[PDB]
Protein backbone atom coordinates (compact mmCIF):
# COMPACT_ATOMS: atom_id res chain seq x y z
CA UNK A 1 0.00 0.00 0.00
CA UNK A 2 0.90 3.69 0.23
CA UNK A 3 2.19 4.25 -3.27
CA UNK A 4 -0.64 6.42 -4.53
CA UNK A 5 -2.82 5.64 -7.51
CA UNK A 6 -2.85 3.16 -10.36
CA UNK A 7 -4.75 3.98 -13.54
CA UNK A 8 -5.55 2.08 -16.74
CA UNK A 9 -6.61 4.50 -19.46
CA UNK A 10 -7.24 4.13 -23.18
CA UNK A 11 -5.35 5.95 -25.91
CA UNK A 12 -8.36 8.18 -26.39
CA UNK A 13 -8.57 9.11 -22.73
CA UNK A 14 -11.25 7.00 -21.08
CA UNK A 15 -10.10 5.37 -17.85
CA UNK A 16 -10.92 1.67 -17.93
CA UNK A 17 -9.71 1.08 -14.40
CA UNK A 18 -8.60 3.26 -11.51
CA UNK A 19 -7.14 2.70 -8.06
CA UNK A 20 -6.47 5.79 -5.97
CA UNK A 21 -4.84 5.79 -2.53
CA UNK A 22 -3.87 9.45 -2.38
CA UNK A 23 -5.69 12.28 -4.08
CA UNK A 24 -3.74 12.88 -7.26
CA UNK A 25 -4.22 16.01 -9.34
CA UNK A 26 -5.86 14.96 -12.62
CA UNK A 27 -3.33 17.04 -14.56
CA UNK A 28 -0.45 14.87 -13.32
CA UNK A 29 -1.40 12.01 -15.64
CA UNK A 30 -3.06 14.48 -17.99
CA UNK A 31 0.28 16.25 -18.26
CA UNK A 32 1.92 12.84 -18.66
CA UNK A 33 0.19 11.63 -21.84
CA UNK A 34 0.41 15.18 -23.23
CA UNK A 35 4.26 14.83 -23.46
CA UNK A 36 4.77 11.16 -23.83
CA UNK A 37 2.20 10.59 -26.53
CA UNK A 38 1.20 13.99 -27.97
CA UNK A 39 4.41 16.05 -27.97
CA UNK A 40 6.84 13.19 -27.51
CA UNK A 41 10.18 14.79 -26.58
CA UNK A 42 11.85 11.95 -24.62
CA UNK A 43 10.04 8.60 -24.72
CA UNK A 44 10.34 5.22 -26.43
CA UNK A 45 7.79 2.41 -26.22
CA UNK A 46 8.88 -0.39 -23.91
CA UNK A 47 8.23 -2.39 -20.76
CA UNK A 48 9.77 -1.62 -17.35
CA UNK A 49 11.98 1.02 -19.00
CA UNK A 50 12.96 4.70 -18.61
CA UNK A 51 9.76 6.54 -17.60
CA UNK A 52 11.12 10.05 -17.44
CA UNK A 53 10.14 13.38 -18.95
CA UNK A 54 9.53 17.09 -18.43
CA UNK A 55 6.81 18.72 -20.49
CA UNK A 56 7.31 22.26 -21.64
CA UNK A 57 4.53 24.76 -22.05
CA UNK A 58 2.45 23.65 -24.93
CA UNK A 59 0.37 22.12 -22.11
CA UNK A 60 1.83 22.94 -18.72
CA UNK A 61 4.49 22.13 -16.12
CA UNK A 62 4.27 18.43 -15.62
CA UNK A 63 6.56 16.97 -12.87
CA UNK A 64 8.59 13.99 -14.12
CA UNK A 65 6.56 11.08 -15.28
CA UNK A 66 6.03 7.83 -13.19
CA UNK A 67 6.63 4.45 -14.86
CA UNK A 68 4.27 3.29 -17.57
CA UNK A 69 3.33 0.72 -20.21
CA UNK A 70 1.70 0.98 -23.67
CA UNK A 71 -0.33 -1.62 -25.59
CA UNK A 72 -0.58 -0.36 -29.19
CA UNK A 73 -3.08 -2.97 -30.44
CA UNK A 74 -5.52 -2.19 -27.64
CA UNK A 75 -4.38 1.37 -27.04
CA UNK A 76 -4.37 1.14 -23.26
CA UNK A 77 -1.77 2.75 -21.04
CA UNK A 78 -0.77 1.67 -17.55
CA UNK A 79 0.32 4.32 -15.08
CA UNK A 80 1.49 3.60 -11.57
CA UNK A 81 2.17 6.74 -9.59
CA UNK A 82 5.40 7.47 -7.75
CA UNK A 83 5.70 10.07 -5.01
CA UNK A 84 8.05 12.70 -6.51
CA UNK A 85 11.21 10.54 -6.50
CA UNK A 86 10.10 8.37 -3.56
CA UNK A 87 9.77 4.75 -4.70
CA UNK A 88 10.43 1.04 -4.41
CA UNK A 89 11.18 -0.71 -7.69
CA UNK A 90 8.24 -3.16 -7.28
CA UNK A 91 5.92 -0.96 -9.41
CA UNK A 92 8.09 -1.73 -12.39
CA UNK A 93 7.63 -5.40 -11.69
CA UNK A 94 4.06 -4.38 -10.92
CA UNK A 95 3.14 -2.16 -13.87
CA UNK A 96 4.31 -4.30 -16.82
CA UNK A 97 3.08 -7.67 -15.66
CA UNK A 98 -0.05 -5.97 -14.36
CA UNK A 99 -0.77 -5.11 -17.96
CA UNK A 100 -0.22 -8.82 -18.65
CA UNK A 101 -3.05 -9.71 -16.26
CA UNK A 102 -5.35 -6.93 -17.49
CA UNK A 103 -4.58 -7.73 -21.11
CA UNK A 104 -5.11 -11.42 -20.47
CA UNK A 105 -8.49 -10.91 -18.85
CA UNK A 106 -9.94 -8.27 -21.14
CA UNK A 107 -7.86 -8.34 -24.35
CA UNK A 108 -10.81 -9.83 -26.22
CA UNK A 109 -13.03 -6.85 -25.50
CA UNK A 110 -11.13 -4.17 -27.42
CA UNK A 111 -12.06 -6.05 -30.58
CA UNK A 112 -15.64 -4.75 -30.39
CA UNK A 113 -15.41 -1.50 -32.34
CA UNK A 114 -18.52 0.52 -31.57
CA UNK A 115 -17.87 1.40 -27.92
CA UNK A 116 -15.37 2.72 -25.36
CA UNK A 117 -16.83 0.39 -22.77
CA UNK A 118 -14.62 -2.32 -21.38
CA UNK A 119 -16.14 -3.87 -18.31
CA UNK A 120 -13.23 -5.04 -16.17
CA UNK A 121 -15.07 -4.84 -12.84
CA UNK A 122 -13.83 -8.08 -11.24
CA UNK A 123 -10.20 -6.91 -11.69
CA UNK A 124 -9.60 -5.43 -8.21
CA UNK A 125 -9.52 -8.94 -6.73
CA UNK A 126 -6.56 -9.96 -8.91
CA UNK A 127 -4.90 -6.61 -8.28
CA UNK A 128 -4.81 -7.14 -4.51
CA UNK A 129 -3.31 -10.61 -4.93
CA UNK A 130 -0.59 -9.03 -7.02
CA UNK A 131 0.06 -6.08 -4.70
CA UNK A 132 0.82 -8.41 -1.81
CA UNK A 133 3.42 -10.47 -3.67
CA UNK A 134 5.61 -7.35 -3.79
CA UNK A 135 4.52 -6.25 -0.32
Amino acid sequence: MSLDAFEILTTSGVVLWSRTYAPVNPSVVNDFITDVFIEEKSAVAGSKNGGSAASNPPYKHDQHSLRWTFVKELGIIFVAVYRSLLHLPWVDKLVDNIRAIFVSLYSEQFKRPNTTIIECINFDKYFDQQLQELE
Partner: protein
Protein backbone atom coordinates in the same frame (compact mmCIF):
# COMPACT_ATOMS: atom_id res chain seq x y z
CA UNK B 1 -24.61 9.72 -39.42
CA UNK B 2 -21.76 11.55 -37.72
CA UNK B 3 -21.61 14.37 -35.21
CA UNK B 4 -18.21 15.85 -34.40
CA UNK B 5 -17.37 16.67 -30.80
CA UNK B 6 -14.84 19.54 -30.80
CA UNK B 7 -13.13 21.72 -28.19
CA UNK B 8 -10.00 22.40 -26.10
CA UNK B 9 -8.62 20.03 -23.47
CA UNK B 10 -10.44 19.94 -20.16
CA UNK B 11 -13.68 20.79 -21.94
CA UNK B 12 -14.92 17.37 -20.90
CA UNK B 13 -14.99 16.35 -24.55
CA UNK B 14 -14.04 12.72 -23.92
CA UNK B 15 -16.19 12.60 -20.77
CA UNK B 16 -19.39 13.86 -22.35
CA UNK B 17 -18.87 11.05 -24.84
CA UNK B 18 -18.78 8.62 -21.92
CA UNK B 19 -22.00 10.06 -20.51
CA UNK B 20 -24.13 9.31 -23.57
CA UNK B 21 -22.99 5.70 -23.96
CA UNK B 22 -23.61 4.66 -20.35
CA UNK B 23 -26.98 6.42 -20.19
CA UNK B 24 -29.07 3.40 -21.22
CA UNK B 25 -26.65 1.12 -19.29
CA UNK B 26 -27.70 2.20 -15.77
CA UNK B 27 -31.13 2.86 -14.26
CA UNK B 28 -31.77 6.03 -12.25
CA UNK B 29 -29.89 5.33 -8.98
CA UNK B 30 -26.90 4.52 -11.16
CA UNK B 31 -27.71 0.82 -11.01
CA UNK B 32 -25.96 -1.44 -13.50
CA UNK B 33 -28.79 -2.38 -15.87
CA UNK B 34 -26.87 -5.62 -16.45
CA UNK B 35 -25.64 -7.34 -13.27
CA UNK B 36 -27.94 -10.28 -13.78
CA UNK B 37 -24.82 -11.99 -15.06
CA UNK B 38 -24.76 -14.91 -17.48
CA UNK B 39 -27.16 -13.85 -20.19
CA UNK B 40 -25.09 -14.73 -23.21
CA UNK B 41 -27.15 -13.41 -26.13
CA UNK B 42 -27.96 -9.90 -24.94
CA UNK B 43 -26.49 -8.76 -21.66
CA UNK B 44 -25.25 -5.17 -21.79
CA UNK B 45 -21.88 -4.51 -20.18
CA UNK B 46 -22.05 -3.47 -16.55
CA UNK B 47 -21.16 0.16 -15.94
CA UNK B 48 -20.16 1.49 -12.51
CA UNK B 49 -20.78 5.19 -13.18
CA UNK B 50 -22.86 7.27 -15.65
CA UNK B 51 -19.59 8.95 -16.60
CA UNK B 52 -16.07 7.57 -16.12
CA UNK B 53 -12.78 9.20 -15.25
CA UNK B 54 -10.92 10.44 -18.30
CA UNK B 55 -7.61 12.06 -19.19
CA UNK B 56 -6.85 14.08 -22.32
CA UNK B 57 -7.87 12.34 -25.54
CA UNK B 58 -4.90 11.63 -27.75
CA UNK B 59 -7.02 10.23 -30.54
CA UNK B 60 -10.41 10.59 -32.12
CA UNK B 61 -12.71 7.91 -30.77
CA UNK B 62 -15.84 7.12 -32.72
CA UNK B 63 -18.59 5.62 -30.64
CA UNK B 64 -21.87 3.79 -31.32
CA UNK B 65 -25.00 5.69 -30.30
CA UNK B 66 -28.72 5.47 -30.94
CA UNK B 67 -31.21 8.30 -30.60
CA UNK B 68 -34.76 7.44 -29.65
CA UNK B 69 -37.53 9.74 -30.88
CA UNK B 70 -40.81 8.19 -29.76
CA UNK B 71 -43.41 10.38 -31.43
CA UNK B 72 -44.17 13.59 -29.52
CA UNK B 73 -41.14 12.54 -27.48
CA UNK B 74 -38.77 14.75 -29.45
CA UNK B 75 -35.55 12.88 -29.28
CA UNK B 76 -36.31 10.71 -26.24
CA UNK B 77 -33.66 10.83 -23.51
CA UNK B 78 -30.27 9.19 -24.06
CA UNK B 79 -30.91 7.06 -20.94
CA UNK B 80 -33.80 5.05 -22.40
CA UNK B 81 -32.92 1.57 -23.64
CA UNK B 82 -33.85 0.49 -27.16
CA UNK B 83 -34.45 -2.96 -28.63
CA UNK B 84 -34.78 -1.20 -34.24
CA UNK B 85 -36.88 1.87 -33.45
CA UNK B 86 -34.17 4.51 -33.66
CA UNK B 87 -32.15 6.78 -35.89
CA UNK B 88 -28.53 5.69 -35.53
CA UNK B 89 -25.45 7.89 -35.59
CA UNK B 90 -21.75 8.16 -34.78
CA UNK B 91 -20.47 10.57 -32.19
CA UNK B 92 -16.84 11.15 -32.68
CA UNK B 93 -14.87 12.66 -29.89
CA UNK B 94 -11.71 14.47 -30.95
CA UNK B 95 -8.47 15.66 -29.31
CA UNK B 96 -8.33 19.23 -28.02
CA UNK B 97 -4.57 19.66 -27.81
CA UNK B 98 -3.57 22.37 -30.36
CA UNK B 99 -1.24 19.89 -32.07
CA UNK B 100 -4.05 17.38 -32.60
CA UNK B 101 -6.75 19.88 -33.52
CA UNK B 102 -5.34 20.36 -37.03
CA UNK B 103 -6.15 16.96 -38.54
CA UNK B 104 -9.78 17.23 -37.46
CA UNK B 105 -10.07 20.61 -39.16
CA UNK B 106 -8.79 19.20 -42.45
CA UNK B 107 -11.89 17.00 -42.26
CA UNK B 108 -14.05 20.05 -41.60
CA UNK B 109 -12.53 21.94 -44.53
CA UNK B 110 -12.90 19.35 -47.29
CA UNK B 111 -16.69 18.83 -47.67
CA UNK B 112 -17.93 15.62 -49.26
CA UNK B 113 -14.52 14.57 -50.71
CA UNK B 114 -12.87 13.39 -47.48
CA UNK B 115 -16.26 12.62 -46.06
CA UNK B 116 -15.44 11.90 -42.41
CA UNK B 117 -13.87 8.50 -41.90
CA UNK B 118 -11.12 8.14 -39.34
CA UNK B 119 -8.73 5.21 -39.67
CA UNK B 120 -9.11 4.08 -36.06
CA UNK B 121 -6.19 2.71 -34.02
CA UNK B 122 -4.59 6.04 -35.03
CA UNK B 123 -5.19 9.33 -36.94
CA UNK B 124 -4.84 9.75 -40.71
CA UNK B 125 -2.52 12.28 -42.32
CA UNK B 126 -14.37 -4.92 -37.13
CA UNK B 127 -18.11 -4.94 -37.63
CA UNK B 128 -19.12 -4.88 -41.27
CA UNK B 129 -22.37 -4.09 -43.03
CA UNK B 130 -23.48 -1.16 -45.20
CA UNK B 131 -22.68 1.67 -42.77
CA UNK B 132 -21.91 5.30 -43.57
CA UNK B 133 -20.08 8.29 -42.08
CA UNK B 134 -22.07 11.38 -43.09
CA UNK B 135 -21.39 14.74 -41.44
CA UNK B 136 -24.55 16.65 -40.60
CA UNK B 137 -23.63 18.31 -37.31
CA UNK B 138 -20.67 19.58 -35.32
CA UNK B 139 -20.54 20.30 -31.60
CA UNK B 140 -18.08 22.72 -30.04
CA UNK B 141 -17.63 21.99 -26.35
CA UNK B 142 -16.12 24.53 -23.97
CA UNK B 143 -15.62 24.87 -20.21
CA UNK B 144 -17.93 27.66 -19.00
CA UNK B 145 -16.35 27.42 -15.55
CA UNK B 146 -12.84 28.00 -16.86
CA UNK B 147 -14.18 30.73 -19.14
CA UNK B 148 -14.96 32.73 -15.99
CA UNK B 149 -11.28 33.05 -15.07
CA UNK B 150 -9.82 36.55 -15.28
CA UNK B 151 -6.69 35.08 -16.86
CA UNK B 152 -8.84 35.35 -19.97
CA UNK B 153 -6.39 33.17 -21.85
CA UNK B 154 -9.08 30.52 -22.11
CA UNK B 155 -11.67 32.63 -23.93
CA UNK B 156 -8.95 33.96 -26.26
CA UNK B 157 -7.37 30.62 -27.16
CA UNK B 158 -10.76 28.89 -26.97
CA UNK B 159 -12.45 31.48 -29.18
CA UNK B 160 -9.52 31.29 -31.59
CA UNK B 161 -10.05 27.55 -32.08
CA UNK B 162 -13.78 28.14 -32.53
CA UNK B 163 -12.83 30.84 -35.05
CA UNK B 164 -11.02 28.28 -37.21
CA UNK B 165 -13.74 25.69 -36.59
CA UNK B 166 -16.45 28.07 -37.78
CA UNK B 167 -14.13 29.40 -40.49
CA UNK B 168 -13.45 25.96 -42.00
CA UNK B 169 -17.15 25.12 -42.27
CA UNK B 170 -17.45 28.51 -43.96
CA UNK B 171 -14.83 27.32 -46.45
CA UNK B 172 -16.84 24.09 -46.61
CA UNK B 173 -19.89 26.08 -47.75
CA UNK B 174 -17.76 27.56 -50.53
CA UNK B 175 -17.00 23.90 -51.27
CA UNK B 176 -20.58 23.02 -52.20
CA UNK B 177 -19.22 22.00 -55.60
CA UNK B 178 -18.04 18.68 -54.19
CA UNK B 179 -23.30 21.00 -56.51
CA UNK B 180 -24.47 19.22 -53.36
CA UNK B 181 -24.09 21.68 -50.48
CA UNK B 182 -24.96 20.54 -46.98
CA UNK B 183 -25.83 22.86 -44.13
CA UNK B 184 -23.69 22.19 -41.05
CA UNK B 185 -25.55 23.32 -37.90
CA UNK B 186 -23.15 23.93 -35.02
CA UNK B 187 -23.82 23.55 -31.32
CA UNK B 188 -21.65 25.63 -29.04
CA UNK B 189 -22.05 23.86 -25.71
CA UNK B 190 -21.04 25.56 -22.46
CA UNK B 191 -20.07 22.65 -20.23
CA UNK B 192 -18.89 22.35 -16.59
CA UNK B 193 -22.22 23.83 -15.58
CA UNK B 194 -22.67 22.38 -12.11
CA UNK B 195 -19.75 24.56 -11.00
CA UNK B 196 -20.83 27.88 -9.49
CA UNK B 197 -18.47 29.93 -11.69
CA UNK B 198 -19.95 28.45 -14.86
CA UNK B 199 -20.59 31.32 -17.26
CA UNK B 200 -24.24 31.45 -18.45
CA UNK B 201 -24.97 30.49 -22.07
CA UNK B 202 -26.25 33.92 -23.11
CA UNK B 203 -22.96 35.39 -21.92
CA UNK B 204 -20.93 32.69 -23.66
CA UNK B 205 -22.77 33.55 -26.87
CA UNK B 206 -22.13 37.26 -26.29
CA UNK B 207 -18.48 36.90 -25.28
CA UNK B 208 -17.66 34.60 -28.19
CA UNK B 209 -19.11 36.98 -30.79
CA UNK B 210 -17.01 39.69 -29.21
CA UNK B 211 -13.89 37.54 -29.11
CA UNK B 212 -14.40 35.97 -32.55
CA UNK B 213 -15.27 39.28 -34.19
CA UNK B 214 -12.25 40.99 -32.70
CA UNK B 215 -10.04 38.13 -33.88
CA UNK B 216 -11.26 38.74 -37.43
CA UNK B 217 -10.30 42.38 -36.95
CA UNK B 218 -7.10 41.18 -35.28
CA UNK B 219 -6.50 38.72 -38.13
CA UNK B 220 -7.81 41.05 -40.86
CA UNK B 221 -5.09 43.60 -40.10
CA UNK B 222 -2.43 40.89 -40.26
CA UNK B 223 -10.59 35.15 -44.03
CA UNK B 224 -13.36 37.45 -42.81
CA UNK B 225 -15.43 35.01 -40.78
CA UNK B 226 -19.11 35.90 -41.10
CA UNK B 227 -20.55 38.91 -42.92
CA UNK B 228 -18.69 40.66 -45.74
CA UNK B 229 -19.36 43.91 -43.91
CA UNK B 230 -20.13 43.61 -40.21
CA UNK B 231 -20.61 46.50 -37.80
CA UNK B 232 -19.97 43.73 -35.29
CA UNK B 233 -19.87 39.95 -35.66
CA UNK B 234 -22.93 37.99 -34.56
CA UNK B 235 -23.53 34.24 -34.80
CA UNK B 236 -26.56 35.21 -36.89
CA UNK B 237 -24.24 36.33 -39.69
CA UNK B 238 -23.07 32.73 -40.03
CA UNK B 239 -26.54 31.76 -41.28
CA UNK B 240 -25.50 33.24 -44.64
CA UNK B 241 -23.26 30.20 -44.95
CA UNK B 242 -26.09 27.82 -43.97
CA UNK B 243 -24.62 27.48 -40.50
CA UNK B 244 -27.07 27.19 -37.63
CA UNK B 245 -24.93 28.34 -34.72
CA UNK B 246 -26.39 27.73 -31.29
CA UNK B 247 -25.06 28.39 -27.80
CA UNK B 248 -26.50 25.88 -25.37
CA UNK B 249 -25.42 24.97 -21.85
CA UNK B 250 -25.29 21.77 -19.87
CA UNK B 251 -23.17 19.71 -17.53
CA UNK B 252 -21.72 16.25 -17.88
CA UNK B 253 -21.26 15.84 -14.14
CA UNK B 254 -22.99 16.96 -10.95
CA UNK B 255 -26.32 18.70 -10.57
CA UNK B 256 -27.31 21.18 -13.25
CA UNK B 257 -29.13 21.46 -16.59
CA UNK B 258 -27.98 17.99 -17.64
CA UNK B 259 -26.82 16.81 -21.06
CA UNK B 260 -30.26 16.16 -22.51
CA UNK B 261 -30.60 19.66 -23.96
CA UNK B 262 -27.47 18.94 -25.99
CA UNK B 263 -28.76 15.45 -26.74
CA UNK B 264 -32.09 16.89 -27.89
CA UNK B 265 -30.10 19.17 -30.20
CA UNK B 266 -28.22 16.21 -31.68
CA UNK B 267 -31.23 14.00 -32.43
CA UNK B 268 -33.03 16.87 -34.12
CA UNK B 269 -30.08 17.11 -36.49
CA UNK B 270 -29.40 13.61 -37.81
Amino acid sequence: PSVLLIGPSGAGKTALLTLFERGPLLNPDGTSVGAADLKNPYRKPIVTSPVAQTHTSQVPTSVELAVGANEDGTPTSYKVDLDATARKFLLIDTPGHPKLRGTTLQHLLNPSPSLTIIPTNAPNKSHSDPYKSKLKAVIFLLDAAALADSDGDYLSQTASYLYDVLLSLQKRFHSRKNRAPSSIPVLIAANKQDLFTAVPASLVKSRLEHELGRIRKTRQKGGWLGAVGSKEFKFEEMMEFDMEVEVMGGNVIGDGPGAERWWRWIGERI
